[PDB]
Amino acid sequence: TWRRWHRRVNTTQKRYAICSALAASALPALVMSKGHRIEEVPELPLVVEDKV
Amino acid sequence: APSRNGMVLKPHFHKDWQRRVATWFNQPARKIRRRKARQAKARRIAPRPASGP
Amino acid sequence: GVDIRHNKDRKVRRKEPKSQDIYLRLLVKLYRFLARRTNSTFNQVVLKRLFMSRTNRPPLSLSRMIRKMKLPGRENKTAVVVGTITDDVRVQEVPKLKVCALRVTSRARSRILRAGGKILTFDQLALDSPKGCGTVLLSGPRKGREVYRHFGKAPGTPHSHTKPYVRSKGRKFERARGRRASRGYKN
Amino acid sequence: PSRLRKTRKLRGHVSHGHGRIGKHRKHPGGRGNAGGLHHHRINFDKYHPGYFGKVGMKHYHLKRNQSFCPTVNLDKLWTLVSEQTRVNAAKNKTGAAPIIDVVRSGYYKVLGKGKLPKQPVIVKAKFFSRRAEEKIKSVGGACVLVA
Amino acid sequence: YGTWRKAASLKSNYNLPMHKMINTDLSRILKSPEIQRALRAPRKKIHRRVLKK
Amino acid sequence: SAHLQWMVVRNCSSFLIKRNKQTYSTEPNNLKARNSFRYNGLIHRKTVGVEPAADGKGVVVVIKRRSGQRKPATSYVRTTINKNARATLSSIRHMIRKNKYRPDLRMAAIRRASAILRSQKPVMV
RNA sequence: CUAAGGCUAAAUACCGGCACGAGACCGAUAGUCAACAAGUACCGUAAGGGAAAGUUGAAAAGAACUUUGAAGAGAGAGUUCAAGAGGGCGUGAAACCGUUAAGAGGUAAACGGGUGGGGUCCGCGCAGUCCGCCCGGAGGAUUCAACCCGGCGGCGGGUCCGGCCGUGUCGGCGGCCCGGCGGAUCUUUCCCGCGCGGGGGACCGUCCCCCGACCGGCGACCGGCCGCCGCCGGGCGCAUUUCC
RNA sequence: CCGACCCGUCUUGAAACACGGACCAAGGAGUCUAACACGUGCGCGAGUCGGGGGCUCGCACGAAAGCCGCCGUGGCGCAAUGAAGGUGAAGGCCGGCGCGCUCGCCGGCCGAGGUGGGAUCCCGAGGCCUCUCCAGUCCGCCGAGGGCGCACCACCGGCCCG
RNA sequence: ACUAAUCGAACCAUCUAGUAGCUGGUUCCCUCCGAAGUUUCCCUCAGGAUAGCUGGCGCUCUCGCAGACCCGAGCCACGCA
RNA sequence: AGCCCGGCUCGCUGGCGUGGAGCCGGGCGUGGAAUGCGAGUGCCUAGUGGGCCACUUUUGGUAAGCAGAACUGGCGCUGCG
RNA sequence: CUACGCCGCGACGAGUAGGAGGGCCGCUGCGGUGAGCCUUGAAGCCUAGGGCGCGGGCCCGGGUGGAGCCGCCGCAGGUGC
Ligand SMILES: [Mg+2]
Ligand SMILES: [Mg+2]
Ligand SMILES: [Mg+2]
Ligand SMILES: [Mg+2]
Ligand SMILES: [Mg+2]
Ligand SMILES: [Mg+2]
Ligand SMILES: [Mg+2]
Ligand SMILES: [Mg+2]
Ligand SMILES: [Mg+2]
Ligand SMILES: [Mg+2]
Ligand SMILES: [Mg+2]
Ligand SMILES: [Mg+2]
Ligand SMILES: [Mg+2]
Ligand SMILES: [Mg+2]
Ligand SMILES: [Mg+2]
Ligand SMILES: [Mg+2]
Ligand SMILES: [Mg+2]
Ligand SMILES: [Mg+2]
Ligand SMILES: [Mg+2]
Ligand SMILES: [Mg+2]
Ligand SMILES: [Mg+2]
Ligand SMILES: [Mg+2]
Ligand SMILES: [Mg+2]
Ligand SMILES: [Mg+2]
Ligand SMILES: [Mg+2]
Ligand SMILES: [Mg+2]
Ligand SMILES: [Mg+2]
Ligand SMILES: [Mg+2]
Ligand SMILES: [Mg+2]
Ligand SMILES: [Mg+2]
Ligand SMILES: [Mg+2]
Ligand SMILES: [Mg+2]
Ligand SMILES: [Mg+2]
Structure with missing residues (x-):
């Protein structure tokens, strides 16, 4: 049971990865390459009103 | 046997350590239980400060 | 058969x-293209430094950069380091420096920009001086x-x-025999 | 990842990288630091001189807190206050000198490595070295002691 | 997460990471006139081996 | 940027097929359908693609407009050419060459249009 | 500090027990010894040792009936999608065996290289490809080019007009009441605690949105106007054009 | 037709009259933890690290992820040396002075010395140009020499502790 | 001699996966490089440490990178064997 | 890193402006034998540490397909004629 | 012109113990992805069937079978006899 199942990652690196993922989520080529079927979405950084 | 340069190491693993190994898989559960106990105590002493005296 | 040795071929x-x-x-x-299509040996050196590992690209302190750029005849030259510029808190006055670096520490960057300096990435360095003219490679x-x-x-x-x-430093840790003449020998 | 290790490449080779002659046996040479004076003496003398024997006075019940005395050098001395402090002191018309409390910053002794900028400063410390005191007096400062 | 001009106000020590390459448009960098003036002419002829008659 | 997005998706993409010592890319605007920086139909600021028409006659030439790069709904302009083969190839040649709209894809687009038209014409006996 | 008297919850431990939940675990030689009438069968005087063993089918619809045999077992018939699923019955490998077919056989077999013969198969093999231009022949058809209208793109434009963008630069009108966050920077010499604190101010650093201007640019942040080009749709063009 | 001894293993030497192997199926042997060392990749960088705790609908995922900042206590690094008491890392030039006595009192500067190598960079006399010339306009290449010299190496000095 | 087919110290379970410098085994492919049985020390001589022989990772430099086809226009590298 | 000119320092040496060493400038390239080759440098490191054979030299032995050394090559690790 | 790509020229190719690299070699499970495959037939197995690769191995045809399985990008092993 003491296999060392868990890894600790530096907080700065975790924040860095979050920033990279967010930056990539606004590029249509990368989201299309993930295969998310964005062909009729009006704007890839898709923002809706707070009513939702 | 020593091999080239190195640090003289003295592991304290000559005493049947595998019978006494404390794993920490219950650490998140322990944190949850402690938080629940804190909240229950704070509710019990309602206007009194939660941390105590 | 040929009488040659193959241990140093690769x-x-x-x-x-x-x-x-x-x-x-x-x-x-970018620098592969520049080193191939220019005769500037500066581009070759920069490319081979880009290939290098982190231990082979040690950080450059602000104090050492200032000291090397302070040498005569290096006025208005671009300091180029393939690596990280590090702030040195032992220096008090920072002169105006035009520096290209792979990374700059946040504090060192703030000090350089506050001193009126300029910071360039390596693509900006390629645009500013494709052959590496007017550069001090540090x-x-x-x-x-x-x-x-x-x-x-x-x-x-x-x-x-x-x-x-040694796992620990103290009077009990590797100081007796072979370290003083009172215990066997010293050398 | 076990898929990146030599074991995945040593499959099919009988000796598993340990040789056919000397093999891989349990403990040839002893266990741990065995024979450090007899048959590993060359290794011990070559890489760990001083390993054998006693030197010095033993002291029972050592308390590290008693000897706790962190040090700071004069080159890092001005980093203990704000930049505003140093610039205001430098451009001050009057000869007022700022006070630096290294005990507040977490240091007990001021050491003398480096040089100071040419401006007076009062330094509060538990201990001073001789050259640190000399260099502080050189820039027109003062060294004051605290307990 | 902050701007590059502002530190993050909800993380108390965090700022956005920096780019080691401001302009990643390799095509425009290579086709820029100041890069092109510094280059030697391309050697675009293939010199295959000559059969030794 | 195109080069940066290429470094992202050159080996990790849902359109990437690696089989039989070959590689292919199935993104919509890829002439020759090959995994390459030049022919990738997503990473470039301007792209051109040729597709069969909805009905089995003619071709649809789609080009990427300049402005709405982050707006995929209006980023592509599609025209339908249902002329004879020579006229269709002339139209595609003029759209690529006269506009100077990616002149390095001209023969790829012409060959793809020829393939589509040959597939569309009725089979023989 | 006050021994040689005493009690005391919480935070802590938990491979037994009761009841649960889950898993990048194992999948019937694995996982508990034990997926099953398993601490069972069985072994030893005893202490104790201790297995093997899952799967028909959706449903028994589990083969009525006839026939040979004393029967086991067969031949028919029947159920089923299937018994080439028939009560240790999902699939059903290898070793090994029977039979059939082909080939061969006195240096034990087996093997590497090279051919040859035979055989089973494969090739829609069996009159042998295609396709770009042009010439000639014999037929069709919108329509070919150029013009007109409309739409949409690409490129360029002193910024033509905005919207702006980067870097500075001014007066801070602009914020501790009517914009923030920080400073080991100075203070009531206006405010509540002994001449001894906490507030409130000033300054500084980053700011913030702003009133505007000058520098570089329309940039890959976009629009409107023009100019050129391209495409498409609809007209006209109906024949030495164009296309099939 | 030619070639061809049975594999594995220990061995100087195996086809061995050396050992294991009748055949087939399934199982079957460098793993995990801890501690070091070096190399490589990543983040931040004279700092770095929340791993223990706490805060967040307590829980499908989530026993995750996020956050703390007067939670950075603490670990490692930033200072060494001595058994210890302890001590603890800045020099070079121009000067006026004792007596610039191989040294004591200060100023003005600058801020880790010097030699030999040293990628790179800088200057560069003179050359390379067109239909030609007397006459200078702008920049490109080659270039003998010279200069500043990164890292690193060898050496000589200097500073700290015994 | 005998002490339940066991006796120069029974049987059972556990410590226990006891230790072994000794024997046996140690599971896919291709490519590249490629040994040693020697020195010194060891209650060492069937074993280790140590140097040597090996591999891997590099790094610091040297000759230049030439004419877009082409075309050199006393003196010809640091250093090594 | 050579040679040759000057000059400076020394608390060493000393009849002597002596000797020696160091330091500072300057001028000398016909690169001061042949041949070949690109060199320098660091870290980590496995296996090995039973060897055997041949020409020649060689010790013990009557001799040995014996025992022990030196040199080079080989077998071990290597197929092929 | 998948720049981790493509192209050119020259030399070279033995290998135990051992070291390293590559693997679009192979097994199992996890995160993604293939608007993947499948009762109009998955896995497994059999095959004088057609092939590919130096090889590890893989693809396709035919049969049997009767319900699940695989490619690619990463991750992790109780991973190859
Ligand atoms: Mg050869
Ligand atoms: Mg070799
Ligand atoms: Mg091997
Ligand atoms: Mg084997
Ligand atoms: Mg001894
Ligand atoms: Mg079982
Ligand atoms: Mg089974
Ligand atoms: Mg019977
Ligand atoms: Mg069936
Ligand atoms: Mg069956
Ligand atoms: Mg048979
Ligand atoms: Mg053996
Ligand atoms: Mg023998
Ligand atoms: Mg053998
Ligand atoms: Mg024999
Ligand atoms: Mg025998
Ligand atoms: Mg034996
Ligand atoms: Mg036998
Ligand atoms: Mg057996
Ligand atoms: Mg098996
Ligand atoms: Mg958490
Ligand atoms: Mg602390
Ligand atoms: Mg130097
Ligand atoms: Mg020295
Ligand atoms: Mg045992
Ligand atoms: Mg043996
Ligand atoms: Mg041995
Ligand atoms: Mg002999
Ligand atoms: Mg051997
Ligand atoms: Mg050899
Ligand atoms: Mg041979
Ligand atoms: Mg080889
Ligand atoms: Mg296993």
Whole structure:
């Protein structure tokens, strides 16, 4: 049971990865390459009103 | 046997350590239980400060 | 059959960065093109430094950069380091410096920009001076590492001052026999 | 990742990288630091001189807190206050000198490595070295002691 | 997460990471006139081996 | 940027097929359908693609407009050419060459249009 | 500090027990010894040792009936999608065996290289490809070019007009009441605690949105106007054009 | 037709009259933890690290992820040396003075010395140009020499502790 | 001699996966490089440490990178064997 | 890193402006044998540490397919004529 | 012109113990992805069937079978006899 199942990652690196993922989520080529079927979405950084 | 340069190491693993190994898989559960106990105590002493005296 | 020896045929050297950093790979593409299509040996040196590892690209302190750029005849030249610029808190006054670097520490960047300096990435350096004209190519201390204190002749040999590997430093840890004439010998 | 290791490449080779002659046996040479004076003496003398024997006075019940005395050098001395402090002191018309409390910053002794900028400063410390005091007096400062 | 001009106000020590390559447009960098003036002419002729008659 | 996005998706993409010592890319605007920086139909600021028409006659030439790069709904302009083969190839040649809209894809687009038209014409006996 | 008297919850432990939940675990030689009438069968005087063993089918619809045999077992018939699923019955490998077919056989077999013969198969093999231009022949058809209208793109434009963008630069009108966050920077010499604190101010650093201007640019942040080009749709063009 | 001894293993030497192997199926042997060392990749960088705790609908995922900042206590690094008491890392030039006595009192500067190598960079006399010339307009290449010299090496000085 | 087919110290379970410098085994492919049975020390001589022989990772430099086809226009590298 | 000119320092040496060493400038390239080759440098490191054979030299032995050394090559690790 | 790509020229190719690299070699499970495959037939197995690769191995045809399985990008092993 003491296999060392868990890894600790530096907080700065975790924040860095979050920033990279967010930056990539606004590029249509990368989201299309993930295969998310964005062909009729009006704007890839898709923002809706707070009513939702 | 020593091999080239190195640090003289003295592991304290000559005493049947595998019978006494404390794993920490219950650490998140322990944190949850402690938080629940804190909240229950704070509710019990309602206007009194939660941390105590 | 031919009377030759094959043990040194394959030269051991970096032909590419071992890193998977895509920005580093893009600017390696840029400097590969520049080193191929120009006669500037500066581009070749910069490319081979880009290939290098982190221990082979030691950080350059602000104080050392200032000292090297302060030398005569280096006015209005671009300091180029393939690596990280590090703030030195031991220096008080920072002059105006135009520096290109792979990374700059946040505090060092703030100090350089507050002193009226300019900071360039390597693509900007390629645009500003494709042949590397008017540049001072600097390097951090390559042997400024703890491992080099242990490297060398063995500690238990005469006239060797190489640091031994000890788990603790104290009067009980490797100081008696072979370290003083009162216990056997010293060398 | 076990898929990146030599074991995945040593499949099919009988000796598993340990040789056919000398083999891989349990403990040839002893266990741990065995024979450091007999048959590993060359290794011990070559890489760990001083390993054997006693040197010095033993002291029972050592308390590290008693000897706790962190040090700061004069080259890092001005980093203990704000940049505003140093610039205001430098551009001050009057000869007023700022006070630096290294005990407040977490240091007990002021050491003398480096040089100071040419401006007076009062330094509060538990201990001073001789050259640190000399260099502080050189820039027109003062060294004052605390307990 | 902050701007590059502002530190993050909800993380108390965090700022956005920096680019080691400001302009990643390799095509425009290579086709820029100041790069092109510094280059030697391309050697675009293939010199295959000559059969030794 | 195109080069940066290429470094991202050159080996990790849902359109990437690696089989039989070959590689192919199935993104919509890829002439020759090959995994390459030049022919990738997503990473470039301007792209051109040729597809069969909804009905089995003619071709649809789609080009990427300049402005709405982050707006995929209006990023592509599609025209339908249902002329004879020579006229269709002339139209595609003029759209690529006269506009100077990616002149390095001209013969790829012409060959793809020829393939589509040949597939569309009725089979023989 | 006050021994040689005493009690005391919480935070802590938990491979037994009761009841649960889950898993980048194992999948019937694995996982508990034990997926099953398993601490069972069985072994030893005893202490104790200790297995093997899952799967028909959706449903028994589990083969009525006839026939040979004393029967086991067969031949028919029947159920089923299937018994080439028939009560240790999902699939059903290898070793090994029977039979059939082909080939061969006195240096034990077996093997590497090279051919040859035979055989089973494969090739829609069996009159042998295609396709770009042009010439000639014999037929069709919108329509070919150029013009007109409309739409949409690409490129360029002193910024033509905005919207702006980067870097500075001014007066701070602009914020501790009517914009923030920080400073080991100075203070009531206006405010509540002994001449001894907490507030409130000033300054500084980053700011913030602003009133505007000058520098570089329309940039890959976009629009409107023009100019050129391209495409498409609809007209006209109906024949030495164009296309099939 | 030619070639062809049975594999594995220990061995100087195996086809061996050396050992294991009748055949087939399934199982079957460098693993995990801890501690070091070096190399490589990543983040930040004279700092770095929340791993223990706490805060967040307590829980499908989530026993995750996020956050703390007067939670950075603490670890490692930033200072060494001595058994210890303890001590603890800045020099070079121009000067006026004792007596510039191989040294004591200050100023003005600058801020880790010097030699030999040293990638790179800088200057560069003179050359390379067109239909030609007397006459200078702008920049490109080659270039003998010279200069500043990264890292690193060898050496000589200097500073700290015994 | 005998002490339940066991006796120069029974049987059972556990410590226990006891230790072994000794024997046996140690599971896919291709490519590249490629040994040693020697020195010194060891209650060492069937074993280790140590140097040597090996591999891997590099790094610091040297000759230049030539004419877009083409075309050199006393003196010809640091250093090594 | 050579040679040759000057000059400076020394608390060493000393009849002597002596000797020696160091330091600072300057001028000398016909690169001061042949041949070949690109060199320098660091870290980590496995296996090995039973060897055997041949020409020649060689010790013990009557001799040995014996025992022990030196040199080079080989077998071990290597197929092929 | 998948720049981790493509192209050119020259030399070279033995290998135990051992070291390293590559593997679009192979097994199992996890995160993604293939608007993947499948009762109009998955896995497994059999095959004088057609092939590919130096090889590890893989693809396709035919049969049997009767319900699940695989490619690619990463991750992790109780991973190859
Ligand atoms: Mg050869
Ligand atoms: Mg070899
Ligand atoms: Mg091997
Ligand atoms: Mg084997
Ligand atoms: Mg002894
Ligand atoms: Mg079982
Ligand atoms: Mg089974
Ligand atoms: Mg019977
Ligand atoms: Mg069936
Ligand atoms: Mg059956
Ligand atoms: Mg048969
Ligand atoms: Mg054996
Ligand atoms: Mg023998
Ligand atoms: Mg054998
Ligand atoms: Mg024999
Ligand atoms: Mg025998
Ligand atoms: Mg034996
Ligand atoms: Mg036998
Ligand atoms: Mg057997
Ligand atoms: Mg098996
Ligand atoms: Mg958490
Ligand atoms: Mg602390
Ligand atoms: Mg130097
Ligand atoms: Mg020295
Ligand atoms: Mg045992
Ligand atoms: Mg043996
Ligand atoms: Mg041995
Ligand atoms: Mg002999
Ligand atoms: Mg051997
Ligand atoms: Mg050999
Ligand atoms: Mg041979
Ligand atoms: Mg080989
Ligand atoms: Mg296994």
